[PDB]
Amino acid sequence: CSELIQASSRITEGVNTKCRLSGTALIRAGSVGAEACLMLKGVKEDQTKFLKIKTVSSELSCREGQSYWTGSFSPKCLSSRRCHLVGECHVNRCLSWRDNETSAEFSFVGESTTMRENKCFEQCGGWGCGCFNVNPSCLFVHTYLQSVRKEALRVFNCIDWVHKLTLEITDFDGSVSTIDLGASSSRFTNWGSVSLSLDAEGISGSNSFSFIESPGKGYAIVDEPFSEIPRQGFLGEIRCNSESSVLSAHESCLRAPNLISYKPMIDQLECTTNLIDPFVVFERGSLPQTRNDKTFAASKGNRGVQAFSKGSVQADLTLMFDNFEVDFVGAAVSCDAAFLNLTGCYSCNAGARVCLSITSTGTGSLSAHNKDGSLHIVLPSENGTKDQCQILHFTVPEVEEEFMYSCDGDERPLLVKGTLIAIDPFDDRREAGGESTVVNPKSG
Amino acid sequence: GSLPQTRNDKTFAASKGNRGVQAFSKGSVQADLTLMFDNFEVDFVGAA
Amino acid sequence: PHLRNRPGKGHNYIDGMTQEDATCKPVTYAGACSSFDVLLEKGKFPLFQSYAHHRTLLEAVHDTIIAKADPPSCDLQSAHGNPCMKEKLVMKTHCPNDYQSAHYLNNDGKMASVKCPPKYELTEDCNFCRQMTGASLKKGSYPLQDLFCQSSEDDGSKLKTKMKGVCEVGVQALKKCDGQLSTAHEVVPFAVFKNSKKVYLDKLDLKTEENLLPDSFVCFEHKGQYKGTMDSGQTKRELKSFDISQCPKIGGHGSKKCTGDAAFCSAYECTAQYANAYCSHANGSGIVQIQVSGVWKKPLCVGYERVVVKRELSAKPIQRVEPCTTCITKCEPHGLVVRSTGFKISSAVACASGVCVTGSQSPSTEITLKYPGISQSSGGDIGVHMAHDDQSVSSKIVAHCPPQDPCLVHGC
Numbered sequence A: 001c002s003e004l005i006q007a008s009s010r011i012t013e014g015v016n017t018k019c020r021l022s023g024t025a026l027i028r029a030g031s032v033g034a035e036a037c038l039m040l041k042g043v044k045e046d047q048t049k050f051l052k053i054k055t056v057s058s059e060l061s062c063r064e065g066q067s068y069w070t071g072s073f074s075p076k077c078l079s080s081r082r083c084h085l086v087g088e089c090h091v092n093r094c095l096s097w098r099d100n101e102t103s104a105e106f107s108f109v110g111e112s113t114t115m116r117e118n119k120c121f122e123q124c125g126g127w128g129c130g131c132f133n134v135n136p137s138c139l140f141v142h143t144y145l146q147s148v149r150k151e152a153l154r155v156f157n158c159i160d161w162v163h164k165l166t167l168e169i170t171d172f173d174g175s176v177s178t179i180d181l182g183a184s185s186s187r188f189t190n191w192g193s194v195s196l197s198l199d200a201e202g203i204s205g206s207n208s209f210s211f212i213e214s215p216g217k218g219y220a221i222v223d224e225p226f227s228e229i230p231r232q233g234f235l236g237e238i239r240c241n242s243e244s245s246v247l248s249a250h251e252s253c254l255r256a257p258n259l260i261s262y263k264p265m266i267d268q269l270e271c272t273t274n275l276i277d278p279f280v281v282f283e284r285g286s287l288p289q290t291r292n293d294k295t296f297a298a299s300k301g302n303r304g305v306q307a308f309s310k311g312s313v314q315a316d317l318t319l320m321f322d323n324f325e326v327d328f329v330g331a332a333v334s335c336d337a338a339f340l341n342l343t344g345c346y347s348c349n350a351g352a353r354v355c356l357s358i359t360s361t362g363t364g365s366l367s368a369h370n371k372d373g374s375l376h377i378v379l380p381s382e383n384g385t386k387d388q389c390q391i392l393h394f395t396v397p398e399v400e401e402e403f404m405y406s407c408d409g410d411e412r413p414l415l416v417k418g419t420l421i422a423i424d425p426f427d428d429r430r431e432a433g434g435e436s437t438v439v440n441p442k443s444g
Numbered sequence B: 001g002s003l004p005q006t007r008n009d010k011t012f013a014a015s016k017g018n019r020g021v022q023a024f025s026k027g028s029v030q031a032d033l034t035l036m037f038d039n040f041e042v043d044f045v046g047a048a
Numbered sequence C: 001p002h003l004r005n006r007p008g009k010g011h012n013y014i015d016g017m018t019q020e021d022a023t024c025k026p027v028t029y030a031g032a033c034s035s036f037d038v039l040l041e042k043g044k045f046p047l048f049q050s051y052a053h054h055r056t057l058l059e060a061v062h063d064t065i066i067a068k069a070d071p072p073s074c075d076l077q078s079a080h081g082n083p084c085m086k087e088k089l090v091m092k093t094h095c096p097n098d099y100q101s102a103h104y105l106n107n108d109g110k111m112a113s114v115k116c117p118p119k120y121e122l123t124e125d126c127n128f129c130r131q132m133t134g135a136s137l138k139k140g141s142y143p144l145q146d147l148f149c150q151s152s153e154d155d156g157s158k159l160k161t162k163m164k165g166v167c168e169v170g171v172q173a174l175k176k177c178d179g180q181l182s183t184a185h186e187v188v189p190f191a192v193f194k195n196s197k198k199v200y201l202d203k204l205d206l207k208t209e210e211n212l213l214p215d216s217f218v219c220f221e222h223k224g225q226y227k228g229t230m231d232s233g234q235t236k237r238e239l240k241s242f243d244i245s246q247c248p249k250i251g252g253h254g255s256k257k258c259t260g261d262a263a264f265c266s267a268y269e270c271t272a273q274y275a276n277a278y279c280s281h282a283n284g285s286g287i288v289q290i291q292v293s294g295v296w297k298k299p300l301c302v303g304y305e306r307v308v309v310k311r312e313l314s315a316k317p318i319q320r321v322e323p324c325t326t327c328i329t330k331c332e333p334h335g336l337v338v339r340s341t342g343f344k345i346s347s348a349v350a351c352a353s354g355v356c357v358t359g360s361q362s363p364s365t366e367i368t369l370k371y372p373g374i375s376q377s378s379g380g381d382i383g384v385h386m387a388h389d390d391q392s393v394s395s396k397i398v399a400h401c402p403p404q405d406p407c408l409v410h411g412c
């Protein structure tokens, strides 16, 4: 499918004399679920090492910007009522009480890291009230917030979405390699590095929603703009910088003014507040939600969020210094293959599925090539009988071809039959295409 | 994006000697160069 | 001065230099030990000062955690003509004045030391001994390296130094290299495990986990304290060390009544009577584990050193040679056509005696361009510069053509 003649090396009998193949390869990445093929040709009926690049999936990952944490809080109040001219019950001190200054009555609290505030309220003054003096008495209140539930939620926003391709690197003699990379980025794998161009679109715009993450539980979406300043009656009215601060109600957390409602009725004070339960909002908007045809959802491995939108990209990944050769592969191996069936479509991004029954005596590959060399089929061969499958592209309603299949041995013919279904576009001018298309919603 | 690229009919490319870049665009110029104090003469040229 | 409540025996003295046993045998809050007080100076030995409740090198030696090297300390007075000072000479140290000895952890993972002849002192680089008249040498030995030790049973016989791009670090010859060799002095962290040698590391990823073993508790007592050791009138309020081995374990027997904080009461049995000692839990004691090769292990000692490392900058920065000629260029009456075998051509330019002509197209194995000036009529040599999709292909080629006939070009 693609040779390395300008950098090919002698890959002596039996032993390997690989010379660290340095020539880069420029081949177009296959569509989603397709594969990219390489040819390492040595001596006929020998060598024929195949490096494959499976395209697992293309996702529109999120690039998070600012973030904060929040939880559920409830207040507790301590009250102390003193008559006039007792302690700091002077009226001038009474109205000018700073919220961050603690009264002397609540000194057993002492120094604490919890979020807290202090208020002073004037009351009646007189023998009916309880104090001989007729000037107004004072009620000092110290309130501190405490976390109700032992959980926290992280609220963030996506400034932009980035295309992100996952590849499966079927390496020479072993396919234990899976990598993920973005646009114009390279990853230092074995035998050099793999780079991705993805020159079509490196971004897919922005958004004006907010996202919630519950660690170990998933994600969710809320339909409000991400505000960096706390607001009463909204989400993130009390916000912190870490889960520990939320779970401990640490004083470093920010909160909006006037959240606590005070009821200084003469019998007992009532300290209470109405707070948006972030857990309720989190449960309301679990991720599988569609907004103006975007359908945000959890990325595989629950490491983020996606964005399914109509579109497509062009990916041209490049290898470099690809060198992975051994000596034990000098021995030849024989196999037997049997055509199984054909399904799929033609001239479609999904492509056509070919499944083959391979009856082999050992480890090996398959190198069926058509008469004109346009179409290539590669499938591993294993001991006994196995059923493998592959993805190709066609442009004919009916498929009837012959391929020259030979697994490092004698050349044999393989004949493929079957037809392909027709995709209805409901609107066609010239053709569909075969590029790399990202997932789209139905309403798009 | 190696240099031999054309953008909106400009075709930037490497200058001779790889000391910079060029810009091939439609146009023309009028050049009127001037010499001054040009004196380069010897004696052996007297022979025919 | 809680840091002077040493774990274990707390014997901060070296063999031979036993003239300070009053204060260097178990280090306590009272006296001053020359081989220990240097570790507590601000700005010096910061790694140990962070892990201040773990054993020192001398303490680890006296607890049989770390062995003593063959010739434990070959005296320069009697063995200055022997190949002793080899591992010391590759380190860049800095001794203060009036010190007659200095100890370090050698390559094998044992403790060695350098001792100057009597009345001499180690110089500022600890490499030579010099004599000063009327100078009072300190009775201890200067700790050369910044390290802390602990007791571990984890095996490390398969542990070895794995540094990338290093031909030789310290006294260890990692491999054999030829060519350029960047030689310098660098700060390398290192660890020592059980049944192993020194292991230099590229990174220091270490974590500490707490426990309730006796080494994690600091037990003290007052001087002049009623019904305790040293029960006599004092003119000063000072503390005294206590051995936690006497306080009974929970649901067990003991010899002394013992009280403490929450952790001690959870681990040990706190008394309901008048107590004999107070047992607190240490700042940061515990078990320190180092990440080697991606897996955590329990080291015997952890420290850092300033040693001479030889690196290889590069074998070859980059190789750019591309005499590629895998294309056919032929001048045609319709246009100048070049077919590039393999690599596709998107845009190209052709120059012929100053005048050049450009061409743009989709990536394809061939491209056609208009002829530059009168080169079509005059033939000659025309240079072509094109942009290929691949690499390692020459972008400058030359095409030689004979004069052409425009009649076929414009024929209609």
Ligand SMILES: *[C@@H]1O[C@H](CO)[C@@H](O[C@@H]2O[C@H](CO)[C@@H](O[C@@H]3O[C@H](CO)[C@@H](O)[C@H](O)[C@H]3NC(C)=O)[C@H](O)[C@H]2NC(C)=O)[C@H](O)[C@H]1NC(C)=O
Binding pocket: C378, C379, C380, C381, C400, C401, C402, C403
């Ligand atoms: C009209 O006359 C011109 C003058 O002779 C011709 O133009 C040039 O003539 C040169 C020799 O007189 C040629 O030089 C040769 O060039 C090739 C490579 O091009 C070299 O390998 C040779 O060493 C060099 N010298 C010799 C003696 O061959 C030029 O190539 C040539 N220019 C061309 C052909 O473009 C014209 O060819 C001529 N035209 C007609 C229509 O008769």
Ligand SMILES: *[C@@H]1O[C@H](CO)[C@@H](O)[C@H](O)[C@H]1NC(C)=O
Binding pocket: A085, A086, A087, A088
């Ligand atoms: C009365 O007693 C209070 C103590 O509760 C004291 O703070 C205040 O200053 C006193 N007022 C006087 C002495 O006028």
Ligand SMILES: *[C@@H]1O[C@H](CO)[C@@H](O)[C@H](O)[C@H]1NC(C)=O
Binding pocket: A098, A100, A101, A102
């Ligand atoms: C917080 O309290 C301190 C001491 O009580 C005071 O100095 C400071 O001004 C207060 N901060 C305010 C009022 O913003």
